[PDB]
């Protein structure tokens, strides 16, 4: 049946919303351009600009290098997709009867092999763009945030947040518009075969996350090598400020924030958005919506994202125009209110969307069977994801903000040294997983019960329906991070650094939250994808108690540890090289410590560049090859266990690592800020307590910025990869069992 | 058909081998008593006053601890009787056999009562396991010290002999009490072997239940002391490890016995007991138990019987035949024990498989009787036997300072504590790869040949050499105490260097112990899980259903929740300990100088208090989970909980224990300075050394409190779920029956 919203309306609505989000982005970038600076104390404006140029140059330089390799791998992998998928049917041009309706004729598998390759390259390119554009806004906004810190926290908050919003709206609108264009273009060929149309479209999410994996790991190793070395020698060893221009590793540190925390994070979340939409589309494609060619209801997930863009635009105005911050304690609650307002507004918007864009009754594909589902049930599926996210947000704030006991107790444990700081920080992280998991479990149960894999997919998308805002508050953080980096390097007033420090502490929390959303939605979408894989692979039952499934389960559960081993070791080793180099300069460059001689920043940039371009390959190989090796050698049943295991296991370590690192960082920020009697008693900077906090913070650096956040990509990537290659594994896989 | 070995041969063989194991243990204790002492000669007295202090403190805490757990044990036995008694409304009449409708079985109420009995038997045998181990350990520690005056080889021997006393006593005792209980229970049950062995699984629930609290309680006690002592003593005050001026040193050394010995003993007993019981429950409704073939039915105990003899002979090799002259011989001699035992036991299992099984039989396999050949069972127990050896090898590689991973971790101390920790975390994560593969291969091989019986019997294979296993492991804390006593006795520097060498090998040895514990825990839990699914009459555990999946993800979360509790508890107590040690050094005149004596008792009290109180919540989480989920959500959801906690929890268990042990041995590497590289990180007190100590104390709760207790979390929930399966299947799933 039709929805109230006609098919042609939907065709207009979606791009109109994408354009509005892009226009909003441009507008905000315009208001940000009103902060003037140039390299041509006017000396402080000039100095900020030179430091900005050095960071902008370094970030653009690394991404070009990183993206070169990644782009080459993308082209190579696109060839694997075409060959493997095309080999399922012997590269035949013959049409065959539709698997979803034998009375109809469908386009040949070969075309779907071709179009899958096309959508994979689309998604890979859009992912690269997402990280790159993010880096361009951040390296533009950073020094403008620093100058605005002269007028106070509030003002600096606005430019950092407006800019964060520039990244959020661009990335969401562009991801939505590309997906919308791909669908229409593919439709010209596929016609009434919507089954094959949306099967080909799933490459979009595979391309998104493939590129994101390397972006996150690569950028992550770069930034943390620099960060750890800079901090340990400068702060623990040489008793100088954080980001002191005498430190040779500092430019690389600050390039690092843009190259990992921004560019990697942006690709990462684009991957989340693309997989969630694609997962919803495929299940819908062989459900009542796709089978009856009802465009509006078919595109229900895109309509949800369209309204999310508009909802977030409104929400943004509360932080941007309707409120002014005047005190430091207002920063975090303003960020939190962004999540609360969007959640409340999006709940109404999802209700409207479910009312106009769905028929009241319809059927959802449920493992071979059409299940009767009502529109108010679908409303609940997306709403429970959206609300699970907010919960995850509130909980993650509790565990990572220095406004609450857990982090203050972590800081407090520094009084007995580094070892107690770390014991307390590890325990906090472990503790932190409890409620997010229960929230995710509730989303799964609710959405699984109402609408099977479609419901779960749409719950994932629900959690990401407010992605423009989520990205805004997240991207706000590394921009505020660089801003204080620039303030210190430019030799600015202490009052400036105190304000940037307040913005940056809130950005640590907001970064943790962003990881909570990525992990939550990854658990959801991976389960939707897992269930779709099982159908696509003609598995009758994924039975835990068969030898093939179980070995997949326990091996899958180990993958996140193997992956974390590799990334931790990489950062550890490169940071070790970094400490040696920084020590060498402090110890052998005459006048460096006295500020009369300038250090060699390029060498530190090179150390972190060489380690990340090299060391990103094994962890990327582990994730990308696992489904292929398991699918080809052991078959689809074993891969099933691998998908379930990696999901349930990876999510625990992902969460605990991200929150542990977050807690260590803000515990240190709390000592640095000395804003209460307790904080002050752990001070001053340079005290044994502070240096113990720094030890904890630097251990947390690769935890929260390299391994931790990349884990969500491991999970969700192996799941789309498995789905896309499913026909190939089902037909030509399981070799070991076939030859024995 | 039947075996070559007659039922009566088996009835005699099993206790004969136990009593041999006890005799051989009683023997080694006599030899150790040839070393004499009572409270140079100034030293011998001091060593004995120190020993007495440690022995007094160990005994005191266990009585306190065992008092709490014994009372919990009585409370829980009541729940077993009630819940299992309620399945058939406390009827006294027989009913149809759960495994065969066409037959009549003993009433469920009787089985409710015998489960309670075997539970209490298992609890008591678990405390006796822990207690005896503590007795011999606190007996042999000063005796290892005084024979350290006469070189490494001597001290090693009295240490290893004393560890054999524990290994052989626990192994022989656990086997004898089970054998006896089976024979006693068989009086009532008669031909109903299904009911007999369903009752007997209480034994496994008993051992592991009391083990949970002894590992956790004992683990929190020891690491509170350990961390406080090492932080104020070595980091802050620049005084030697185990220095008598440090008020926490008695508590530290008490802790090695109360935790690493007693807790660990209970732990491995539980492993032994659950493994045997799991093999018995599946066999009992297979051709062996249906044809009432007593020999074949008791195949698991016959494997354990020969295991003792094999370990006895293996022991002679390190005790008699060979002698250590260079410290670099210790680690090899201990691994030799593993290799020799694995080789001799491969022969013994083949023999046992040849004489105790029919050539063909059937194994219960989810409703269907599955054809299995005795040569296939041989491979099931052997594959578990060899997976254990592989796990030991890989664990040595990642924890011993004779290889690159640990040496690299030590090396990273040049760049501070932060790099030491990052490198140690990564080593732990990395260390899980091969053990999981070995475990997955054992699972595939044993599952394919013989379903859950095969898996259960692969678990027992990995624990078939448990006497040797416990011997090498118990050797460690004795050696650890031995050097603590040496230093407290003010003895020469060469004494401490010897004991430090012994102590270092014992670190690796403890990591290996944990590998066997986690390896067999994965295997037994999987078999138990499979028996739980049958007993609860679940057709299929389908991962893609809402009930199973939410159980899967929540179960995967449980080991982190558990790790959170046990780490914070150590972190909190050790924070107090540091403040207490600082207080004594900063208030008591003559303390730092050495003209005054510290109050050791305030440190004992801090860790005593913290452990007794803080062991409760993680014990609650583990005991309550199957009850809460089974009653509220049902057997489908609990099935997910069991699978998820298993696959998730072994990862964090392995990584935590190896990271911990690696940090410890990297520290020992620096403290020994036995190479140019080691020496370049020294001397003791250097920045590198202090960074190592930071890492070591972080690894303390990881490897001694949370890590090793994780293996108990997993196997405990599994038997707990199996025991209460009829109850959950009948009266559980409430939330779904209401809404
Ligand atoms: K941040
Ligand atoms: K030890
Ligand atoms: Mg830093
Ligand atoms: Mg930064
Ligand atoms: Mg910074
Ligand atoms: Mg930060
Ligand atoms: Mg950092
Ligand atoms: Mg210690
Ligand atoms: Mg000790
Ligand atoms: Mg010791
Ligand atoms: Mg040790
Ligand atoms: Mg220790």
User: Can you tell me the distance from the alpha carbon of A489 to that of B427, in angstroms, rounded to the nearest whole number?
Assistant: 36
**Residue A576: which of B412, B559, B643 has the nearest Cβ?**
B412
- Asked if B567 lies within 8 A of A449 by C-beta distance, the reply is no
User: Can you tell me the distance from the alpha carbon of B266 to that of B217, in angstroms, rounded to the nearest whole number?
Assistant: 12
CA B21 remoteness from chain centre = 20
Backbone angles phi, psi at B358, to 5 degrees: -75, 160
Report every protein residue that has its C-beta within 5 angstroms of ion ligand 6. Answer: A 508, 665
Q: Resolution (in Å) of the shown entry?
A: 2.3
A45, with CB counted inside 10 A (0-12, 13-18, 19+), is middle
Please tell me chain A's helix, strand, coil percentages from 3-state DSSP, rounded to the nearest 5: 80, 5, 15
- Asked if A441 lies within 8 A of B550 by C-beta distance, the reply is yes
A610, with CB counted inside 10 A (0-12, 13-18, 19+), is middle
| 3 state SS of A324 | coil
User: Can you tell me the distance from the alpha carbon of A500 to that of A151, in angstroms, rounded to the nearest whole number?
Assistant: 12
User: Can you tell me the distance from the alpha carbon of B484 to that of B598, in angstroms, rounded to the nearest whole number?
Assistant: 16
Interface test with B, best of A413, A417, A645, A690 (most B CBs within 10 A): A417
Instruction: Select from A154, A239, A738 the least CA-distant residue to A503.
Output: A154
Residue of B nearest to A367 (CA): B544
User: Can you tell me the distance from the alpha carbon of A430 to that of B127, in angstroms, rounded to the nearest whole number?
Assistant: 30
CA distances from A97 to A101, A115, A288, B359 (A): 7, 19, 19, 52
| 3 state SS of B542 | strand
Q: Which residues contact A389 (CB under 8 A, 6 or more apart)?
A: A343, A462, A463, A464, A466, A516, A517, A520, A521
For B249, other C-beta atoms within 10 Å of its C-beta total 28
- Asked if B567 lies within 8 A of A236 by C-beta distance, the reply is no
Tell me B357's DSSP state: S
* Structure-derived torsion over alpha carbons of residues A703, A277, A203, A193, reported in degrees to the nearest 10: 160
- Cβ distance A400 to A662 under 8 Å? yes
Instruction: Select from B154, B55, B216 the least CA-distant residue to B479.
Output: B154
Q: Among positive and negative, which fits the CA dihedral A649, A652, A655, A657?
A: negative
Residue of A nearest to B651 (CA): A558
CA B541 remoteness from chain centre = 30
Chain B contacts of A426, Cβ < 8 Å? 567, 698
| Angle made by CA atoms A732, A733, A739, in degrees to the nearest 5 | 95
- Cβ distance B70 to B209 under 8 Å? no
CA distances from A292 to A131, A280, B542 (A): 38, 16, 31
Distance B658 CA to ligand 6 centre (A): 30
User: Can you tell me the distance from the alpha carbon of A584 to that of A229, in angstroms, rounded to the nearest whole number?
Assistant: 12
- Asked if A562 lies within 8 A of B430 by C-beta distance, the reply is yes
- Asked if A579 lies within 8 A of B533 by C-beta distance, the reply is no
- Asked if B564 lies within 8 A of A416 by C-beta distance, the reply is no
CA distances from B654 to A646, B6, B433, B571, B662 (A): 17, 42, 10, 21, 12
**Greatest alpha-carbon span in chain B:** 82
Annotated binding residue A101: no
Instruction: Select from B78, B55, B76 the least CA-distant residue to B213.
Output: B76
Q: A367's torsion region: left (phi>0), alpha (psi -120 to 50) or beta? A: left
Annotated binding residue B664: yes
Backbone angles phi, psi at B437, to 5 degrees: -60, -45
Tell me A105's DSSP state: E
- Cβ distance B267 to B215 under 8 Å? yes
Name the residue with tokens 């292929």. Answer: A628
Residues A49-74: b if buried by 16+ CB within 10 A, e if exposed: bbbbebbbebbbebbeebbebbbebb
The tokens describing B157, both together, are 């021997």
Q: A538's torsion region: left (phi>0), alpha (psi -120 to 50) or beta? A: left
What technique determined this structure?
X-ray
Annotated binding residue B480: yes
Instruction: Select from B366, B280, B325 the least CA-distant residue to B152.
Output: B325
Residues B79-103: b if buried by 16+ CB within 10 A, e if exposed: ebbebbbbbbeeeeebeebbbeeee
For B517, other C-beta atoms within 10 Å of its C-beta total 29
Strands A101-106 and A361-366: unpaired
Annotated binding residue B226: yes
CA distances from B353 to A722, B218, B347, B516 (A): 43, 39, 10, 23
| Angle made by CA atoms A154, A160, A162, in degrees to the nearest 5 | 95
Annotated binding residue A665: yes
Chain A contacts of B528, Cβ < 8 Å? none
Tell me A447's DSSP state: H
| Angle made by CA atoms B629, B632, B635, in degrees to the nearest 5 | 55
- Asked if B575 lies within 8 A of A651 by C-beta distance, the reply is no
Q: Tell me which H or E stretch contains A225.
A: helix A203-231
Bridge partners of B371, per DSSP, are B362
- Asked if B426 lies within 8 A of A565 by C-beta distance, the reply is yes
User: Can you tell me the distance from the alpha carbon of A353 to that of A336, in angstroms, rounded to the nearest whole number?
Assistant: 25
User: Can you tell me the distance from the alpha carbon of A726 to that of B517, in angstroms, rounded to the nearest whole number?
Assistant: 38
Chain A contacts of B579, Cβ < 8 Å? 416
Number of A–B residue contacts, CB under 8 Å: 240
Chain A contacts of B570, Cβ < 8 Å? 423
Chain B contacts of A682, Cβ < 8 Å? none
Peptide bond into A684 cis (omega under 30): yes
User: Can you tell me the distance from the alpha carbon of B396 to that of B378, in angstroms, rounded to the nearest whole number?
Assistant: 27
The tokens describing A678, both together, are 């307790």
Strands B360-365 and B368-373: antiparallel
Residue B117 to chain A, least CA–CA distance (Å)? 31
- Cβ distance B302 to B13 under 8 Å? yes
Interface test with B, best of A426, A566, A711 (most B CBs within 10 A): A426
**Residue A547: which of B412, B432, B443 has the nearest Cβ?**
B443
Chain A contacts of B415, Cβ < 8 Å? 232, 575-576, 579-580
- Cβ distance A406 to A395 under 8 Å? no
- Asked if A547 lies within 8 A of B423 by C-beta distance, the reply is no
**Residue B567: which of A430, A433, A449 has the nearest Cβ?**
A430
The tokens describing A297, both together, are 């209801």
CA distances from B331 to A529, A550, B519 (A): 49, 35, 22
Bridge partners of A373, per DSSP, are A362
User: Can you tell me the distance from the alpha carbon of B44 to that of B36, in angstroms, rounded to the nearest whole number?
Assistant: 9
Tell me A543's DSSP state: B
User: Can you tell me the distance from the alpha carbon of B576 to that of B574, in angstroms, rounded to the nearest whole number?
Assistant: 5
- Asked if A433 lies within 8 A of B560 by C-beta distance, the reply is yes
Instruction: Select from A710, A711, A138 the least CA-distant residue to A475.
Output: A138
User: Can you tell me the distance from the alpha carbon of A597 to that of A580, in angstroms, rounded to the nearest whole number?
Assistant: 19
Q: Tell me which H or E stretch contains A370.
A: strand A369-374
User: Can you tell me the distance from the alpha carbon of A332 to that of A335, in angstroms, rounded to the nearest whole number?
Assistant: 5
Chain A contacts of B440, Cβ < 8 Å? 551, 554-555
Angle, helices B493-535/B262-284, rounded to nearest 10 degrees: 30
Residue of A nearest to B552 (CA): A648
- Asked if A427 lies within 8 A of B568 by C-beta distance, the reply is yes
The tokens describing B68, both together, are 């709490």
């Amino acid at each position: 049946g039709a929805a109230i919203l006609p098919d042609l309306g939907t065709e207009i609505l979606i791009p109109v919303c994408a354009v509005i989000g892009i226009a909003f982005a441009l507008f905000q970038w315009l208001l940000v351009s009103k902060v003037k600076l140039s390299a041509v104390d006017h000396n402080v404006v000039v100095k900020c600009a030179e430091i900005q140029n050095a960071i902008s140059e370094g970030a653009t330089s690394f991404l070009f290098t990183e993206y070169k390799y990644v782009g080459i791998f993308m082209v190579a992998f696109a060839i694997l997709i075409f060959l493997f998928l095309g080999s399922v049917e012997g590269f035949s041009t013959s049409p065959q009867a539709c698997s979803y309706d034998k009375t109809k004729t469908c386009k040949p598998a070969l075309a779907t092999a071709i179009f899958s390759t096309v959508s994979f390259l689309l998604g890979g390119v859009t992912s690269l763009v997402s990280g790159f554009l993010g880096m361009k806004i951040a390296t533009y906004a950073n020094a403008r945030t620093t100058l605005e810190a002269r007028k106070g926290v509030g003002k600096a908050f606005i430019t950092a947040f407006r800019s964060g919003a520039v990244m959020g709206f661009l990335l969401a609108a562009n991801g939505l518009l590309v997906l919308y264009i791909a669908i229409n273009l593919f439709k010209i060929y596929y016609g009434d075969d919507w089954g094959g149309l949306f099967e080909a479209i799933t490459g979009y999410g595979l391309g998104g996350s493939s590129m994101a994996l390397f972006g996150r790991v690569g950028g992550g190793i770069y930034t943390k090598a620099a960060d750890v070395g800079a901090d340990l020698v400068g702060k623990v060893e040489r008793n100088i400020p954080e980001d002191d221009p005498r430190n040779p590793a500092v430019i690389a540190d600050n390039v690092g924030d843009n190259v990992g925390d921004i560019a990697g994070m942006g690709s990462d979340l684009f991957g989340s958005y693309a997989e969630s939409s694609c997962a919803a589309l495929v299940v819908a494609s062989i459900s009542s919506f796709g089978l009856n060619h009802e465009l509006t209801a078919m595109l229900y997930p895109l309509i949800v994202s369209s309204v999310g863009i508009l909802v977030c635009l409104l929400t943004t105005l509360f932080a941007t125009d309707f409120f002014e911050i005047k005190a430091v304690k207002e920063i975090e609650p303003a960020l939190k209110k962004q999540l609360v307002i969007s959640t409340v507004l999006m709940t109404i918007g999802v209700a409207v969307v479910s009312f106009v864009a769905l028929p009241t009754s319809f059927t959802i594909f449920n493992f071979g069977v059409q299940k009767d589902v009502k529109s108010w049930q679908l409303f609940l599926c997306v709403a429970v994801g959206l609300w699970a996210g907010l919960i995850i947000g509130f909980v993650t704030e509790y565990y990572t903000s220095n406004a609450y006991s857990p982090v203050q107790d972590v800081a407090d444990s520094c009084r007995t040294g580094a070892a107690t700081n770390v014991i307390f920080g590890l325990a906090l992280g472990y503790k932190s997983v409890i409620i997010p998991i229960f929230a995710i479990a509730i989303s799964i149960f609710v959405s699984f019960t109402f609408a099977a894999m479609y419901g779960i997919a749409v719950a994932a998308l629900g959690m990401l329906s407010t992605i423009a805002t989520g990205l805004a508050i997240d991207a706000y953080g590394p921009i505020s991070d660089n801003a204080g980096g620039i303030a210190e390097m430019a030799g600015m007033s202490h009052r400036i650094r105190e304000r940037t420090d307040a913005l940056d502490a809130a950005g640590n929390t907001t970064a943790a939250i962003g990881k909570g959303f990525a992990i939550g939605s990854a658990a959801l979408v991976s389960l939707a994808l897992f269930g779709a894989f099982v159908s696509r692979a003609s598995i009758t039952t994924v039975d835990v108690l068969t030898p093939k499934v179980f070995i997949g389960l326990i091996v899958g559960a180990m993958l996140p540890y193997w992956f974390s081993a590799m990334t931790m070791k990489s950062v550890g080793s490169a940071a070790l090289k970094m400490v040696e180099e920084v020590r060498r300069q402090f110890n052998t460059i005459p006048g460096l410590m006295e500020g009369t001689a300038k250090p060699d920043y390029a060498t530190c940039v090179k150390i972190s560049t060489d380690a990340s371009i090299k060391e990103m390959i094994p962890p990327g190989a582990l994730v990308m090859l696992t489904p292929l090796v398991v699918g080809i050698l052991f078959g689809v049943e074993t891969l099933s266990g691998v998908l379930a295991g990696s999901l349930v296991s990876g999510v625990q370590i992902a969460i605990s690592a991200s929150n542990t690192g977050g807690a260590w960082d803000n515990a240190k920020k709390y000592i640095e800020a000395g804003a209460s009697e307790h904080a002050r008693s752990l001070g001053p900077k340079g005290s044994d307590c502070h240096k113990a906090a720094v030890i904890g913070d630097t251990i947390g650096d690769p935890l929260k910025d390299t391994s931790g956040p990349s884990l969500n990509i491991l999970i969700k990537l192996m799941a789309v990869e498995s789905l896309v290659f499913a026909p190939f594994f089902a037909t030509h896989g399981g070799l070991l069992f076939k030859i024995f």
